[PDB]
Amino acid sequence: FGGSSHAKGIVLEKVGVEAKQPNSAIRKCVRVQLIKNGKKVTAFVPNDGCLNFVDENDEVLLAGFGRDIPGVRFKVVKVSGVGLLALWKEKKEKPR
Amino acid sequence: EFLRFTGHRAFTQRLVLATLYGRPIHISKIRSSSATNPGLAPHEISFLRLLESVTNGSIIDVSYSGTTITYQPGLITGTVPGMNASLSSDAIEHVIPATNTRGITYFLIPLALLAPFSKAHLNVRFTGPGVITSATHGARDLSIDTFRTAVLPLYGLFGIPPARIELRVLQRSCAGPGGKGGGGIVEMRFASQVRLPKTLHLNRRPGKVRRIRGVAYCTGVAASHNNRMITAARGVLNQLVSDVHIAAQYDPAPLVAEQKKKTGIGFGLSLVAETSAEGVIYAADEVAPPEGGVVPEDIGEKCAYQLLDVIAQGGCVMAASAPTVLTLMAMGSEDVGRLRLGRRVVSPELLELARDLKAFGAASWGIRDADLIVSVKGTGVGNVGRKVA
Amino acid sequence: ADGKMSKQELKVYLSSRPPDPTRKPEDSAELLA
Amino acid sequence: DYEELKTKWSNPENIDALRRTRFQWYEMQKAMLQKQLDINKAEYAELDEHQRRQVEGYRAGKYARLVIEGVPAEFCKNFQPRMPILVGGLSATEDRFGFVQVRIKRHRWHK
Amino acid sequence: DILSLRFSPDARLLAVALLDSTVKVFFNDTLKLYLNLYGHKLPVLSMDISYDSKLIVTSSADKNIRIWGLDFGDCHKALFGHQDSILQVAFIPHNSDGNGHYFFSASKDRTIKY
RNA sequence: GGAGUAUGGUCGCAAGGCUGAAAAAUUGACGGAAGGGCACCACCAGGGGUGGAGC
Known part of the structure; x- marks a missing residue:
C-alpha cells in the first residue's frame, strides 16, 4: 500500500465471527477500511482469543504479513494506539 | 399503563411509536359512538397479534368491552430461531381472518417502518383468507406495487438499503364479496437492520417530473382490462x-x-411519477369497487387525475408516505433533518403524528418557508437490541 | 399500443428488487492446425 | 371529490399551466461531520420561542438552574459539599429494564 | 359482420356478437365500449343475458357455451355441452318462480339442454 | 507462459398472459365357447391354531 510501511484503518466488520472452528483463518480475518486511500482490505488478527480486543469502529494500525486463506496480505499490529500483542499479553488496557 | 391516549385515529402509529420508544401506552374509548359493533376492529386485533408475534416481552391487554387496550412494549426481535421460529431463515406465519376489510399495506407500512429497528431479520408471511393485496375503497389503502415502489425508496434515502428488502407476493387479491375477504398471500423479508438512520435533507426543488411508470393489475377479470x-x-x-x-x-x-x-375478483391501477432530481416520487392508485363493475377507462382516467393532483399538490413527498418519512426522521440521530412539504400536503393524520411525537417525548418541529420546510430534531434512540460483534 | 417498455425497464420495475434512486480459415497454417 | 378532480383536470389551461411549471478520506469524513454541525445551528437559528426554546432544548455551555421535584429528605439531611453532584440525562432506552448481555473479564490485578 | 346482438332486460347495456369470434358489450345510452369478451375459437352464434344483467351466456360454433359475469366480464365456467355447433340460447325471464338463472341451449346435434 | 481440472462472483439468454382450478388404428375396444395346465388363497382325507378365563 501507499508508500508507507504501516497503514491505519477502521474495523468495519469482523467477518467470520460466526465460524465454527476456533483458530480458522476465516475466524481470524477482519475486514478493515484504510484511512488514507479509502479501500476495504482484509487483515489477520494474530490469534482467535486476540480477536476479542478488536471492536467495531476502532483505529487500527496494520502491517504486512510476511511468511488457510493464502493471499490476505495484512496483519493487525496496533489497536487504538496500543500494541495488540501487549493487549493479548495483558500488559495494557485499551483506551476507548 | 402509564401514557394515555384516546380515540381510534392513528392507532397503528400510536402502537408503533410506543414499541419504538419503549413507552407503555393505554388507548381508551375505541368505539364509544358505535352501538352495533363497539370495541376493536378485526384488522386492529390482527395488527395486535402481529405486533405480539414480531416483538418479545410485549404485554397487550384488551378489555372486556373491547374499547380500551393497554400495551407495555418489549423489544423488536424479529425471527430469532429460539423464540419466534425454528430456523433463522424461516418465515413467521401470520394469518388474518376472513372478516378483514383493510388492505395489507395497513399492516405493511407500520411493519416496514418498525423493521429497520429490529434485532434479527424480519421474515413475515401474511397468509389466510383476508389478505387483500390491492387498494381498498376502505380508507383508500395503497396497493402492494404502490407501497413497494413508492415508499421503500424512502428507506433507501434514509440508508436502509433496498438491496436487501424482499417484498414478494405469491397470490394477488382484491376484496371480493363486499369489503371483507382477500386470499392473496405475501411475504416481506427485511434483512437490512440499521443502528441509526441517516439524517437526510430534502431541500432542493424537485422540479422536472421526468417520467411516469406504473402497474395495472387484473385478478379474475379479462386481461384486456389493463390494456x-x-x-x-x-x-x-x-x-x-x-x-x-x-x-x-x-x-x-x-x-x-x-x-x-x-374470491378477490377485481382490477386496479397504480401510477408512480419519478422526478429527475432525487428520490422524489408521486404515487396514485385506483381500484374497482368490489361489487360495482365500472368501466376500466373510468378507472384509468381516475388514477391519472389523482396522479396529476398529487403532482400539483406535493412539495417533495406525498401525504401517503409523509408519516413514514417523518417518523424515521424522528428516529434518526440527534441532528436536524429538513423535509420540504407542500402547504396543501399537511393533513390531519400528519398533524396527529406531530401531536403523538410531542406526547411521547420527541422534540417539536420547526416550520419555515422556502411550500414549507419542516425540520425535525432526531431523538437518537435507534434500535435497542443488536448484537454488536 | 406503445406501453411495452423493454426487458431492461421490466427488469428494474417489475422485479422483486425495488429500484434504488442512485442510478442513471485464412491461411494454410491455421487450416492445417 | 372525483367529479371535482375531473373538472379541475379537465380544464386544459390548468393542464397547460402545470405542464409549464412542472415538466483524504479522513478529512472528507470530518468535513461531512462539520457540514452536519453547520446545518444544525444554521437550521434552528430562525426563531426564539419556537426553535431556540422548544425545538433545540436548552443548549450546552449555558449556565442553568434546575428544579427537581421529589427528592428524598435523607439527601438534604446528609448533604456534604465535598462529594459533588452529577446530573446525567437518561435516554429513552436508559429507563427500560431487561437482561443486559455483557462481555466481561476480571481485572489483571484482582486477586 | 354482426352475427347476433341482444339488449339488457333493464335497458342499460347492449351486446353485439361478431364474426371475429368475439363479443362487444356496449352501453345503451352512448355507444362506448364497456368491455369485450374473448376466448371463443369459432364465431359466436347466439347470446342471452340474465334478467338482472348479472350473467351472459354465449353460444359459439366451437361446440360450447360460455357464462360471463357482466361485472368485469370474467368467464364463470366454459362448459362443453353439445356434440355440434350450438345455435341458440335463451334465459327464462321471470324469477317469480325462483329459477331465473336457468337457460336453454339448442344445437345442431338435435338436442336442447336445460 | 501453454494445457487440463475445479471454486466463487459478474453479465446476457431463458423471463411477456385469446387468459381466469377440478389421441392413435388396414396394427384398436370388449367379450362368449371349446380344450389344456396349476393351486392346502381349490375339491378329497386328516391334523392344528385363533375365537371361552386371565396377562
Whole structure:
C-alpha cells in the first residue's frame, strides 16, 4: 500500500465471527477500511482469543504479513494506539 | 399503563411509536359512538397479534368491552430461531381472518417502518383468507406495487438499503364479496437492520417530473382490462409527458377456504411519477369497487387525475408516505433533518403524528418557508437490541 | 399500443428488487492446425 | 371529490399551466461531520420561542438552574459539599429494564 | 359482420356478437365500449343475458357455451355441452318462480339442454 | 507462459398472459365357447391354531 510501511484503518466488520472452528483463518480475518486511500482490505488478527480486543469502529494500525486463506496480505499490529500483542499479553488496557 | 391516549385515529402509529420508544401506552374509548359493533376492529386485533408475534416481552391487554387496550412494549426481535421460529431463515406465519376489510399495506407500512429497528431479520408471511393485496375503497389503502415502489425508496434515502428488502407476493387479491375477504398471500423479508438512520435533507426543488411508470393489475377479470386502462391513462398523460409506461399484470384467481372458493375478483391501477432530481416520487392508485363493475377507462382516467393532483399538490413527498418519512426522521440521530412539504400536503393524520411525537417525548418541529420546510430534531434512540460483534 | 417498455425497464420495475434512486480459415497454417 | 378532480383536470389551461411549471478520506469524513454541525445551528437559528426554546432544548455551555421535584429528605439531611453532584440525562432506552448481555473479564490485578 | 346482438332486460347495456369470434358489450345510452369478451375459437352464434344483467351466456360454433359475469366480464365456467355447433340460447325471464338463472341451449346435434 | 481440472462472483439468454382450478388404428375396444395346465388363497382325507378365563 501507499508508500508507507504501516497503514491505519477502521474495523468495519469482523467477518467470520460466526465460524465454527476456533483458530480458522476465516475466524481470524477482519475486514478493515484504510484511512488514507479509502479501500476495504482484509487483515489477520494474530490469534482467535486476540480477536476479542478488536471492536467495531476502532483505529487500527496494520502491517504486512510476511511468511488457510493464502493471499490476505495484512496483519493487525496496533489497536487504538496500543500494541495488540501487549493487549493479548495483558500488559495494557485499551483506551476507548 | 402509564401514557394515555384516546380515540381510534392513528392507532397503528400510536402502537408503533410506543414499541419504538419503549413507552407503555393505554388507548381508551375505541368505539364509544358505535352501538352495533363497539370495541376493536378485526384488522386492529390482527395488527395486535402481529405486533405480539414480531416483538418479545410485549404485554397487550384488551378489555372486556373491547374499547380500551393497554400495551407495555418489549423489544423488536424479529425471527430469532429460539423464540419466534425454528430456523433463522424461516418465515413467521401470520394469518388474518376472513372478516378483514383493510388492505395489507395497513399492516405493511407500520411493519416496514418498525423493521429497520429490529434485532434479527424480519421474515413475515401474511397468509389466510383476508389478505387483500390491492387498494381498498376502505380508507383508500395503497396497493402492494404502490407501497413497494413508492415508499421503500424512502428507506433507501434514509440508508436502509433496498438491496436487501424482499417484498414478494405469491397470490394477488382484491376484496371480493363486499369489503371483507382477500386470499392473496405475501411475504416481506427485511434483512437490512440499521443502528441509526441517516439524517437526510430534502431541500432542493424537485422540479422536472421526468417520467411516469406504473402497474395495472387484473385478478379474475379479462386481461384486456389493463390494456384499456393503459390507453385511458396514456390519453390523459400524453398531453404532459412523452414517457408514461405501465406494466400489465394478470393473475387467474385466489382460492380461500369456506371446499375452497375463488374470491378477490377485481382490477386496479397504480401510477408512480419519478422526478429527475432525487428520490422524489408521486404515487396514485385506483381500484374497482368490489361489487360495482365500472368501466376500466373510468378507472384509468381516475388514477391519472389523482396522479396529476398529487403532482400539483406535493412539495417533495406525498401525504401517503409523509408519516413514514417523518417518523424515521424522528428516529434518526440527534441532528436536524429538513423535509420540504407542500402547504396543501399537511393533513390531519400528519398533524396527529406531530401531536403523538410531542406526547411521547420527541422534540417539536420547526416550520419555515422556502411550500414549507419542516425540520425535525432526531431523538437518537435507534434500535435497542443488536448484537454488536 | 406503445406501453411495452423493454426487458431492461421490466427488469428494474417489475422485479422483486425495488429500484434504488442512485442510478442513471485464412491461411494454410491455421487450416492445417 | 372525483367529479371535482375531473373538472379541475379537465380544464386544459390548468393542464397547460402545470405542464409549464412542472415538466483524504479522513478529512472528507470530518468535513461531512462539520457540514452536519453547520446545518444544525444554521437550521434552528430562525426563531426564539419556537426553535431556540422548544425545538433545540436548552443548549450546552449555558449556565442553568434546575428544579427537581421529589427528592428524598435523607439527601438534604446528609448533604456534604465535598462529594459533588452529577446530573446525567437518561435516554429513552436508559429507563427500560431487561437482561443486559455483557462481555466481561476480571481485572489483571484482582486477586 | 354482426352475427347476433341482444339488449339488457333493464335497458342499460347492449351486446353485439361478431364474426371475429368475439363479443362487444356496449352501453345503451352512448355507444362506448364497456368491455369485450374473448376466448371463443369459432364465431359466436347466439347470446342471452340474465334478467338482472348479472350473467351472459354465449353460444359459439366451437361446440360450447360460455357464462360471463357482466361485472368485469370474467368467464364463470366454459362448459362443453353439445356434440355440434350450438345455435341458440335463451334465459327464462321471470324469477317469480325462483329459477331465473336457468337457460336453454339448442344445437345442431338435435338436442336442447336445460 | 501453454494445457487440463475445479471454486466463487459478474453479465446476457431463458423471463411477456385469446387468459381466469377440478389421441392413435388396414396394427384398436370388449367379450362368449371349446380344450389344456396349476393351486392346502381349490375339491378329497386328516391334523392344528385363533375365537371361552386371565396377562
